[PDB]
Amino acid sequence: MPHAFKPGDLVFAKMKGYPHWPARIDDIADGAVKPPPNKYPIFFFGTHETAFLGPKDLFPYDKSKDKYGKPNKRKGFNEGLWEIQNNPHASYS
Ligand SMILES: CC(C)n1cnc(S(N)(=O)=O)c1
């Protein structure tokens, strides 16, 4: 059975006006800005941008990759595909 989301989990993350996007649940660094209650820090591969999302917008990567893991014209999306598949746990700093 599934657990709750935890840092390091891989997802496609959905934001308004964007296709479901390769992403991970991040850790919160000591001293770093925390997300709102019930929100997770989502790091988007390719763009390397962060947003705060709740589970309604988070699709586990293994289940979803056949549906959402195909090339996209959007800026950074194809780069993000490579990262989630090839080095999803790297520092992209
Ligand atoms: C805040 C806004 C500019 N945005 C955050 N993440 C993306 S994305 N999913 O990486 O295309 C866009």
Swiss-Prot record:
Q: Which residues cross the membrane?
A: none
Q: Per UniProt, what does mutating W21A do?
A: Loss of interaction with histone H3K36me2
* Residue ranges constituting the PWWP domain according to the UniProt record: 7-64
Tissue specificity here reads: Widely expressed. High expression is found in heart, skeletal muscle, ovary and testis. Overexpression is frequently observed in hepatocellular carcinoma samples.
Cell location: Nucleus; Cytoplasm
Which superkingdom is the protein from? Eukaryota
Oligomer and partners: Interacts with HDGF. Interacts with trimethylated 'Lys-36' of histone H3 (H3K36me3). Interacts with trimethylated 'Lys-79' of histone H3 (H3K79me3), but has higher affinity for H3K36me3. Interacts with IWS1. Interacts with H2AX, POGZ, RBBP8 and CBX1. Interacts with histones H3K9me3, H3K27me3 and H3K36me2. Interacts with DPF3a (isoform 2 of DPF3/BAF45C). Interacts with SMARCA4/BRG1/BAF190A, SMARCC1/BAF155 and SMARCD1/BAF60A in a DPF3a-dependent manner.
Function recorded in the entry: Acts as an epigenetic regulator of myogenesis in cooperation with DPF3a (isoform 2 of DPF3/BAF45C). Associates with the BAF complex via its interaction with DPF3a and HDGFL2-DPF3a activate myogenic genes by increasing chromatin accessibility through recruitment of SMARCA4/BRG1/BAF190A (ATPase subunit of the BAF complex) to myogenic gene promoters. Promotes the repair of DNA double-strand breaks (DSBs) through the homologous recombination pathway by facilitating the recruitment of the DNA endonuclease RBBP8 to the DSBs.
Family statement drawn from the similarity comment of this UniProt entry: Belongs to the HDGF family.
Protein name according to UniProt: Hepatoma-derived growth factor-related protein 2
